């Protein structure tokens, strides 16, 4: 029986107009699924039909979370979100829990439904307009607008922050060491327990939340690890070929943009001379020392790299082949805040795009946990390919920003 | 005892005000006409006389459609439109014949007799005010305002369709066996029912529209095959474009061919094979709007293969949801591709073309991938599903390509179709150095001012070469050097370069380029049995890259 008898004042960013994003073509089945979904939301009063006097529009589609096979409505509120008054709660946000990324484990909860019990400020409703397209522009599109707080909007978690804080006290007061974080329609629970007692303990937080008037049941397990930024490693061989020394010199030269102390003179020296690429060169006294010194510089961390909340996070991804991908998250080039190697998963080494899309979600999730915000992606894929088939594999309630890299980076293998 | 059409709340753009335009001095004859007209319209309810309060005014005109009788008023809300809010124009694009499913019977009701029976927002009417000037202006012109959706006002189309839909909604709901389509003055209703049980449910419609007063003519008919609709030619079970008459002109200007480009593409959606490469590249850049420019000898043999494609009028059929959807692609050269989407052999629902994206380098596989995404999106739009593809590329070729391509790529379900020319991989760089193959260390360098430079190489066996060059750049000398190594080496060879520029071109794996230099290199690579391209950082005393770098400078 939960629904705030009032509505919180909401407006757009000073001097900014509502969204008017075009709706993209949807398959016949996704359409049918949205029709069923909305017909119910209408009766439940969450939404209402609108007349042509409303010009605003935001894209909409359907997906499926992990397990349930049941279709789920997803609204790409990216435009509305960046145009919506950056919720400056008179309480000053929620100081990113630096301790969530340190917890041995973290469980992700879809508390989205909660939102649908709170009414939306009448003056903002027209801004959440979406259309369920028709096949072949035959009939006109079904137009709707939200009555309750919509999942995916930046304002929902804020307008709701009040009700959530108290729906948690009977837990936060109890468990002092546990960490709880909220982002969009997700609740993140970290701890230092063990799978056994960390798994069942969540159930406790499930029913508890289920007793406060509350896809309710889905949880992705997580355990973020070491080397926020992975070390660069040089090969260790007994016999080097000219080709081996050439690549090594290439990697060190590259690494020196990150670590100034790296030297490659004593190694280049072995190169002086036009030898066959597969010929073995013996390492000179001097050369092995440099290879030793460099190796040592690479062990320590990079020089005073810090996160700047004002600047946005950039995420670069490289296709390494055989279902392996690399990525780096940073704000300033050569100053990584995180690097990783998302290995084999669903792509079932048959679909490059499905893999990339999972990688992106995984990178975004990791990003939400460390800084409490999604990063700007640089995808190694043609825009036309990605725009056609990113929504077929998407499964998160949120959506990040992305751009496309069309030139093959020389540094592919160095990140392997 | 009819029920009203709910009114749509309207408003003017924020911060703006209603129009205040002056009225145009009309001739005595025109005035009488308008008075006759505005007199009846007021009776019908359409308009209404206002007092002096209304400060708003919109120009009004009267015109005689030549060789037809009477007059018809015409208001110019050009200014009321620029001050009216925005409406969700859901009229964005119409269906595609290929998306239509055949129906045993298809009727047409004329509901233009409703565009006026639909009220206008009360508080908005004051903005549609207009004045009928008096004869000799020795009297105050008669003032008026609308009580309905004006003809020409920004939001009349948007508000009309919305109202019509709402009224129709219940009918359609309780009549699954019939299909209604609303767009403008016409309502298309079809069904696969007995012609008897059809004109039946039609009466019901005409009658359902009665509960709101809206009258639909007691029509018999005024039409039959070929149904001329939106530049098409529709039939009970087939369609095609309007007769596409190729201008038998001798002097082609910009508009001559440019009105042949946008008129040829139109034709391409059903006639298999049409091309517009050698024709669109003749006016891609040209001064003036029109101009008698020469047609390349190539833009004459393709346009000739047009009067053989535009010779025999071909027909596109209708979509059947029970049959699978198939899409076939062909390579045509110069970066042109055509496709036919069909369900049954030779029964193309539709056809089309795809042109390469303007770029420096490229390869057929990437092009194919692009055509496939296009057809996919167009298919989702027209039929709500992705068609199965039948492509001119071997499965092995495609596997090799995507598993080794640096970018992520994918094509939906497809099958190889042995219809040449087949798309393939022309060369394939090694992953490791080749044992026993000669190692060529190359380099190039030019002089910024003199534009003079050198390209060359030195190998492990002592082979050496350096060629002087004029009117070159650093990038060109870097490519020429690789070219020399390719020309002077055996079937298997290891090339070492410091040119990031070169590697970037080659790693994109082009099979064709704008640059004749890149093309010669491609040509050499095709001839080789094995090539391993290695990169080393510049000015690091790598040698062999350092030795050649010296020979190539100064
Ligand atoms: C679902 O989206 C649409 O229908 C879009 C509407 C496309 C337009 C027409 C149409 C043609 C067909 C055909 N064939 C149809 O049957 C498959 C249908 C149908 O089924 O829809 C109810 C509609 C059309 C246009 C005309 C014009 N001008 C015209 O007058 C000459 C006539 C006519 O019928 O006169 C006797 C018909």
UniProtKB/Swiss-Prot annotation, chain A:
Effect of residue 185 to N: Strongly decreased RNA-directed and DNA-directed DNA polymerase activities. No effect on RNase H activity
Effect caused by changing residue 153 to F: 10% loss of DNA-directed DNA polymerase activity. 22% loss of RNA-directed DNA polymerase activity
Outcome reported for the amino acid change (mutating residue 65 to R): 10-fold decreased sensitivity to ddATP and ddCTP inhibitors
Stated consequence of mutating residue 52 to G: 74% loss of polymerase activity. 86% loss of RNase H activity
Effect the entry attributes to changing residue 189 to M: 27% increase of DNA-directed DNA polymerase activity. 10% loss of RNA-directed DNA polymerase activity
Result, substituting residue 157 to G: 34% loss of polymerase activity. No loss of RNase H activity
Resulting phenotype, residue 167 to V: 70% loss of DNA-directed DNA polymerase activity. 64% loss of RNA-directed DNA polymerase activity
Effect of mutating residue 386 to L: No effect on RT p66/p51 heterodimerization
Domain Reverse transcriptase residue range list: 44-222
Taxonomic superkingdom: Viruses
TM regions (residue ranges): none
Variant or mutagenesis effect after changing residue 254 to T: Complete loss of polymerase activity. 87% loss of RNase H activity
Effect of substituting residue 390 to L: No effect on RT p66/p51 heterodimerization
Stated consequence of mutating residue 184 to I: 54% loss of polymerase activity according to PubMed:9533880; increases polymerase activity according to PubMed:9657675. No loss of RNase H activity
Essential for RT p66/p51 heterodimerization, annotated site positions: 389, 402
Motif Tryptophan repeat motif per record, residues: 386-402
Reported effect, residue 298 to S: 31% loss of polymerase activity. No loss of RNase H activity
Stretches the record annotates as RT 'primer grip': 215-223
UniProt: Mg(2+) 1 binding residues: 110, 185-186
Phenotypic consequence of residue 153 to Y: 58% loss of DNA-directed DNA polymerase activity. 42% loss of RNA-directed DNA polymerase activity
Outcome reported for the amino acid change (mutating residue 402 to L): Almost complete loss of RT p66/p51 heterodimerization
Effect annotated for changing residue 186 to N: Loss of pyrophosphorolysis (reverse of the polymerase reaction). No effect on RNase H activity
Known outcome of mutating residue 183 to F: 70% loss of polymerase activity. No loss of polymerase activity
Protein name: p51 RT
Organism listed in the record: Human immunodeficiency virus type 1 group M subtype B (isolate BH10)
Encoding gene (name): gag-pol
Shown residues in whole-protein numbering: 600 to 1027 of 1447
